[PDB]
């Protein structure tokens, strides 16, 4: 992420979402389909809960105040190995301690 | 006094080794002591179990009577006797003064130890004086009789091992059951009810030899049904 | 029974001549397929193979000296050393 | 010893097993870096294992090693002239 | 004539110490202390001398024997009094037993001990050629008596020795208690055995 | 997610139990014990790590898809930052030793060749293979008296 952000940003919550994509500097295009909305937020600036459920996001997303804006644009949409590569490194310290035992 | 014991056997030929391998390993060679154990039931007709026992050791001229047993020697009686088994027919019952004679009593999860309490004797005389008469006259009449020899090798902690061969003399003639090979025996007669922590250190000195001795011949202890003096 | 146990002893000893020697024909074919860039693969192994197992042909020279040791091969009697002092005291007066 | 035969002929099978998985030294990402010193240790382990069964059986081939008296005549005849030719 | 013995059914331990003063002229040495027991083994068998009798005595060690109807033998609990050659046959147990712990505890079904009495801490004093040792008994009846012994070196002086016993015992100024001099076998070979018949027979048992 | 992925973890627990005993024997120093026994009992417990390291390579599609950290619920407010380098895994110096695998990678190497050099790497392994069927082919080249009871029952008189 980035620190010069929260120093002047004053994060909060849903305005702390952007301080991520921009901080990590990892979002490209399909996270930039949410950049077409804030680029049509800046470019623009110039029951039904049974018609709703995402339920991947309806049984998760739950209570968010506006992802809605990106939810309607979410309406229009369409490494367990690396924890074991440092336990490969658990093998080497037994490999060289077993090897330095050999002497 | 509670004592414990066990035994095994091997051919006559591979007893040449074992005898001087009881000389190498024991630190002492086997030595000959003749032992004849005889039986008496209590007088069987009494009616109102341990049968009566007896023993002795005896003139070397009297055991083998043929030319003083073909010249003198110590272990020369080893290769001599198998089916030749009568040195003496027992001369029947034998035994009016009794000569020195002795007995004892022993009664019954690694090993087995019987409580053995003992005694000795000197001589007899009178109305029924003799040994057969002051035997059944004591109320105990003959069941049987038995005999043997032995070769023993001294050891640590008062341990001794006598390789033996036996004979049985009776009404129909006497014959040696030593047939088929040779035998051995060893024991420790404890202070009566002596410490069992010496009854756990009595076994483990014998476990050395039991699984050391295992493999020339196995080390194993015989059945109880056959153990009791019971008749 | 000294013969059965030295019988199994040269009966395990001849199972070492099929042991160290197969460590020969192991090194041989590594030079025939040889002449290649990487043909030094078997050179770290084979040469660790017949460098290693060629000391298992050292252990095959100790066996026959044991069966050539059958060809080549409190508590005292020193009581007879009192035969030794004895002869000496008969030597002093004689 | 029939058990030196059962273990050291399973050690003979071990010389048989020791040449087996060693030359057998074979031609995943994390685990194929693994198996490569796995046999440097366990091919050469078992190699010092039959090297150890080489020594065990090299020096355990080594554990396969394992009167004029004239009675008392020349006794008491020289048992006097020793001491009475000693003090007299 | 190397042995003899006798007992009293009328006496007290306080008549035990007295005869010292008049026998203190003949006593040169006070030797080591004895001890003892006696008991009767009653066979539990049915019908058919039917009374079995036992005894024990310690003077420098112990040994045991029994007599029923003129047939007897001797025994021991000891290794010394037993030729070591008995253990040379290996025949010897080395685990010696009280005969009264053999018969009473092992044999309890038939012959259990039917009587017990004794007296302890005996002593010695030396009468020339025949020793004299002394000790007292106590019954279940309270005090049951006193008893003493003598043993002669020379055989032929046994007539003057049995004559000299009642002559220092006439000075008893006391009332009769008697003895037996008899020998079991016409043989009577043991100076050890023949005072036991003057013991059991003179104990009227 | 991975109904059977947890049965892989209990097999990480069986293999981790190979560490348990091992490390409590380390502390069991400095007084010396049973090299043969322990060494073999340490080697044997090591092997299985690789064989559970093996049974993972059949599941290697889920360490690639990786199944990865959808997994962190707890909200451990900060102090899980140590569970973060712990959750984190990643590569230790062992990585410093991975580039030593990279300089042992030596040369080589690409940039080196594209293909036909690689097809001379695979055609380079495959010829090590045939030397082994020439190997196994030369290998098969040299390849009475009654039990003493009744005698004590004969000490009971029994015949
Ligand atoms: Se928002
Ligand atoms: Se855009
Ligand atoms: Se929403
Ligand atoms: Se939707
Ligand atoms: Se080490
Ligand atoms: Se090693
Ligand atoms: Se060292
Ligand atoms: Se022994
Ligand atoms: Se003989
Ligand atoms: Se026992
Ligand atoms: Se008897
Ligand atoms: Se045992
Ligand atoms: Se027994
Ligand atoms: Se080898
Ligand atoms: Se030699
Ligand atoms: Se000697
Ligand atoms: Se390997
Ligand atoms: Se790895
Ligand atoms: Se391995
Ligand atoms: Se001498
Ligand atoms: Se498991
Ligand atoms: Se640990
Ligand atoms: Se370790
Ligand atoms: Se790596």
From Swiss-Prot, chain A:
Domain of life (superkingdom): Eukaryota
Membrane-crossing residue ranges in chain numbering: none
Compartments where located: Nucleus
Role, per record: Component of the Mediator complex, a coactivator involved in the regulated transcription of nearly all RNA polymerase II-dependent genes. Mediator functions as a bridge to convey information from gene-specific regulatory proteins to the basal RNA polymerase II transcription machinery. The Mediator complex, having a compact conformation in its free form, is recruited to promoters by direct interactions with regulatory proteins and serves for the assembly of a functional preinitiation complex with RNA polymerase II and the general transcription factors.
Family assignment from sequence similarity: Belongs to the Mediator complex subunit 6 family.
Misc. remarks from the entry: Present with 4824 molecules/cell in log phase SD medium.
Protein name: Mediator of RNA polymerase II transcription subunit 6
Source organism of this protein record: Saccharomyces cerevisiae (strain ATCC 204508 / S288c)
UniProtKB/Swiss-Prot annotation, chain C:
Organism superkingdom: Eukaryota
One Pfam family cited in the UniProt record for this chain: Med11
Subcellular location, record wording: Nucleus
Signal peptide (residue range): none
Glycoprotein as UniProt keyword: no
An example molecular function term from Gene Ontology annotations: TFIIH-class transcription factor complex binding
Presence of keyword Coiled coil: yes
Entry GO CC: core mediator complex; mediator complex; nucleus
Coiled-coil residue spans: 52-88
Effect after changing residue 13 to K: Results in a decrease of TFIIK and RNA polymerase II occupancies at active promoters
Biological process according to GO: negative regulation of transcription by RNA polymerase II; positive regulation of transcription by RNA polymerase II; positive regulation of transcription elongation by RNA polymerase II; positive regulation of transcription initiation by RNA polymerase II; RNA polymerase II preinitiation complex assembly
InterPro entries: Mediator_Med11
Subunit structure: Component of the Mediator complex, which is composed of at least 21 subunits that form three structurally distinct submodules. The Mediator head module contains MED6, MED8, MED11, SRB4/MED17, SRB5/MED18, ROX3/MED19, SRB2/MED20 and SRB6/MED22, the middle module contains MED1, MED4, NUT1/MED5, MED7, CSE2/MED9, NUT2/MED10, SRB7/MED21 and SOH1/MED31, and the tail module contains MED2, PGD1/MED3, RGR1/MED14, GAL11/MED15 and SIN4/MED16. The head and the middle modules interact directly with RNA polymerase II, whereas the elongated tail module interacts with gene-specific regulatory proteins.
Family stated for the protein in its record: Belongs to the mediator complex subunit 11 family.
Extra information: Present with 396 molecules/cell in log phase SD medium.
Gene giving rise to this polypeptide: MED11
Swiss-Prot record, chain D:
Subcellular location: Nucleus
Domain of life: Eukaryota
Note: Present with 2181 molecules/cell in log phase SD medium.
Subunit structure as annotated in this protein's UniProt entry: Component of the Mediator complex, which is composed of at least 21 subunits that form three structurally distinct submodules. The Mediator head module contains MED6, MED8, MED11, SRB4/MED17, SRB5/MED18, ROX3/MED19, SRB2/MED20 and SRB6/MED22, the middle module contains MED1, MED4, NUT1/MED5, MED7, CSE2/MED9, NUT2/MED10, SRB7/MED21 and SOH1/MED31, and the tail module contains MED2, PGD1/MED3, RGR1/MED14, GAL11/MED15 and SIN4/MED16. The head and the middle modules interact directly with RNA polymerase II, whereas the elongated tail module interacts with gene-specific regulatory proteins.
Keyword Transcription regulation: yes
Native source species: Saccharomyces cerevisiae (strain ATCC 204508 / S288c) (Baker's yeast)
InterPro entries: Med22, Med22_Saccharomyce
Family the entry assigns: Belongs to the Mediator complex subunit 22 family.
GO cellular component: core mediator complex; mediator complex; nucleus
Protein name as it appears in the record: Mediator of RNA polymerase II transcription subunit 22
Pfam families: Med22
GO molecular function: transcription coregulator activity
Any one Gene Ontology BP term: RNA polymerase II preinitiation complex assembly
Chief localisation class: nucleus
Keyword Transcription regulation listed: yes
Gene3D superfamilies: Mediator of RNA polymerase II transcription subunit 22
Keywords linked to the UniProt accession: Acetylation, Activator, Nucleus, Transcription, Transcription regulation
UniProtKB/Swiss-Prot annotation, chain E:
Pfam families for this protein: Med20
Domain of life where this protein originates: Eukaryota
The entry's keywords: Activator, Nucleus, Transcription, Transcription regulation
Transmembrane segments annotated in the record for this chain: none
GO BP term, example: cellular response to nutrient levels
MF terms (GO), sorted A to Z: protein domain specific binding; TFIID-class transcription factor complex binding; transcription coactivator activity
Record's GO cellular component terms: core mediator complex; mediator complex; nucleus
InterPro entries: Med20 (IPR016532), Mediator_Med20 (IPR013921)
Compartment(s) where it occurs, according to its Swiss-Prot or TrEMBL record: Nucleus
Additional information: Present with 1720 molecules/cell in log phase SD medium.
Subunit structure comment from the entry: Component of the Mediator complex, which is composed of at least 21 subunits that form three structurally distinct submodules. The Mediator head module contains MED6, MED8, MED11, SRB4/MED17, SRB5/MED18, ROX3/MED19, SRB2/MED20 and SRB6/MED22, the middle module contains MED1, MED4, NUT1/MED5, MED7, CSE2/MED9, NUT2/MED10, SRB7/MED21 and SOH1/MED31, and the tail module contains MED2, PGD1/MED3, RGR1/MED14, GAL11/MED15 and SIN4/MED16. The head and the middle modules interact directly with RNA polymerase II, whereas the elongated tail module interacts with gene-specific regulatory proteins.
Similarity remark: Belongs to the Mediator complex subunit 20 family.
Protein name: Mediator of RNA polymerase II transcription subunit 20
The organism of origin for this protein: Saccharomyces cerevisiae (strain ATCC 204508 / S288c) (Baker's yeast)
Gene behind this protein: SRB2
């Amino acid at each position: 992420p980035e620190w010069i952000q929260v120093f002047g940003l004053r994060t909060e919550n849903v305005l702390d979402y952007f301080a991520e994509s921009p901080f990590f500097d990892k979002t490209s295009n399909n996270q930039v389909i949410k950049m077409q909305r804030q680029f049509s937020q800046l470019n623009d600036p110039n029951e039904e809960e049974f018609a709703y459920v995402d339920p991947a996001r309806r049984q998760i997303l739950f209570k968010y105040p506006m992802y809605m804006q990106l939810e309607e644009e979410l309406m229009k949409l369409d490494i367990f190995k690396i924890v074991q590569s440092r336990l490969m490194s658990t093998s080497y310290h037994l490999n060289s301690t077993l090897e330095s035992l050999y002497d | 006094v509670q004592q414990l014991s066990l035994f095994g056997s091997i051919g006559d030929d591979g007893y040449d080794l074992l005898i001087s391998t009881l000389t190498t390993i024991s630190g002492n060679p086997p030595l000959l002591y003749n032992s004849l154990c005889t039986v008496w039931k209590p007088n069987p007709s009494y009616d109102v179990p341990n049968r009566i026992k007896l023993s002795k050791e005896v003139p070397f001229s009297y055991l083998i009577d043929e030319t003083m047993m073909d010249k003198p020697l110590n272990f020369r009686i080893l290769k001599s006797f198998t089916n030749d088994k009568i040195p003496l027919n027992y001369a029947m019952t034998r035994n009016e003064s009794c000569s020195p004679w002795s007995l004892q009593i022993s009664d019954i999860r690694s090993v087995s130890m019987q409580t053995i309490a003992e005694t000795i004797i000197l001589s007899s005389a009178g109305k029924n004086s003799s040994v057969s008469s002051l035997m059944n006259g004591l109320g105990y009449v003959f069941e049987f009789q038995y005999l043997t020899i032995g070769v023993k090798f001294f050891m640590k902690h008062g341990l001794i091992l006598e390789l033996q061969k036996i004979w049985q003399i009776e009404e129909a003639g006497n014959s040696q059951i030593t047939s088929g090979g040779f035998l051995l025996k060893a024991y420790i007669n404890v202070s009566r009810g002596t410490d069992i922590d010496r009854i756990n250190y009595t076994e483990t000195a014998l476990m050395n030899l039991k699984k050391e001795l295992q493999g020339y011949i196995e080390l194993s202890v015989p059945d109880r049904q056959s153990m009791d003096s019971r008749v | 029974y000294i013969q059965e146990r030295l019988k199994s002893l040269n009966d395990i000893e001849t199972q070492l001549c099929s042991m160290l020697q197969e460590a020969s024909q192991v090194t041989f074919i590594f030079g025939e397929l040889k002449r290649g860039n990487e043909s030094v693969k078997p050179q770290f192994e084979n040469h660790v193979k017949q460098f290693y197992e060629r000391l298992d042909k050292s252990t095959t020279q100790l066996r026959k000296e044991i069966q050539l040791l059958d060809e080549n091969v409190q508590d005292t009697e020193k009581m007879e050393e009192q035969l030794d002092l004895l002869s000496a005291i008969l030597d002093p007066s004689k | 010893q029939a058990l030196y035969e059962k273990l050291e002929q399973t050690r003979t099978i071990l010389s048989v097993k020791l040449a087996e998985l060693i030359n057998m030294t074979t031609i995943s990402e994390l685990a194929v870096a693994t198996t490569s010193v796995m046999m440097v240790n366990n091919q050469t382990m078992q190699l010092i294992k039959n090297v150890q069964d080489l020594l065990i059986l090299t020096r355990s081939i080594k554990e396969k090693w394992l009167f004029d008296e004239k009675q008392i005549e020349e006794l008491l005849d020289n048992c006097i002239e020793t001491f009475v030719a000693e003090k007299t | 004539g190397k042995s003899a013995v006798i007992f009293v059914e009328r006496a007290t331990p306080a008549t035990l110490t007295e005869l010292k003063d008049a026998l203190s002229n003949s006593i040169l040495s006070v030797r080591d202390p004895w001890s003892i027991d006696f008991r009767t083994y009653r066979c539990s068998i049915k019908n058919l001398s039917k009374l079995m009798y036992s005894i024990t005595f310690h003077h420098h060690g112990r040994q045991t024997v029994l007599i029923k109807d003129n047939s007897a033998m001797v025994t021991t609990a000891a290794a010394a009094d037993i030729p070591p050659a008995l253990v040379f046959n290996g025949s010897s147990t080395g685990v010696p037993e009280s005969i009264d712990t053999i018969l009473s505890s092992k044999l309890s079904n038939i012959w259990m001990q039917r009587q017990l009495i004794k007296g302890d801490a005996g002593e010695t004093l030396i009468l020339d050629g025949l020793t004299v040792r002394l000790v007292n008994l106590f019954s279940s009846t309270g005090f049951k008596g006193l008893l003493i012994e003598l043993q002669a070196d020379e055989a032929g002086e046994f007539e003057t020795k049995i004559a000299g016993i009642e002559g220092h015992l006439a000075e008893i100024r006391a009332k009769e208690y008697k003895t037996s001099s008899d020998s079991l076998g016409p043989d009577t070979s043991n100076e050890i055995c023949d005072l036991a018949y003057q013991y059991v027979r003179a104990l009227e048992l | 997610p991975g109904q059977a992925l947890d049965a892989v973890r209990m097999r990480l627990a069986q293999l981790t139990h190979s560490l348990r005993r091992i490390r409590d024997e380390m502390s069991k120093a400095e007084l010396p014990q049973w090299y043969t026994l322990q060494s073999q009992l340490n080697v044997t417990l090591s092997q299985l790590v690789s064989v559970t390291s093996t049974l993972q390579h059949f599941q290697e599609t889920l360490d690639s898809t990786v199944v990865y950290p959808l997994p962190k619920f707890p909200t451990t407010s900060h102090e899980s930052l140590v569970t973060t380098l712990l959750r984190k895994k990643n590569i230790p110096e062992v990585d410093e030793w991975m580039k030593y695998v990279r300089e042992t990678s030596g040369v080589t190497t690409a940039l080196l060749k594209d293909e036909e050099i690689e097809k001379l790497l695979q055609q380079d392994r495959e010829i090590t293979n045939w030397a082994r069927t020439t190997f196994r082919n030369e290998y098969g080249k040299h390849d009475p008296f009654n039990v003493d009871d009744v005698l004590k029952f004969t000490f009971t008189g029994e015949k």
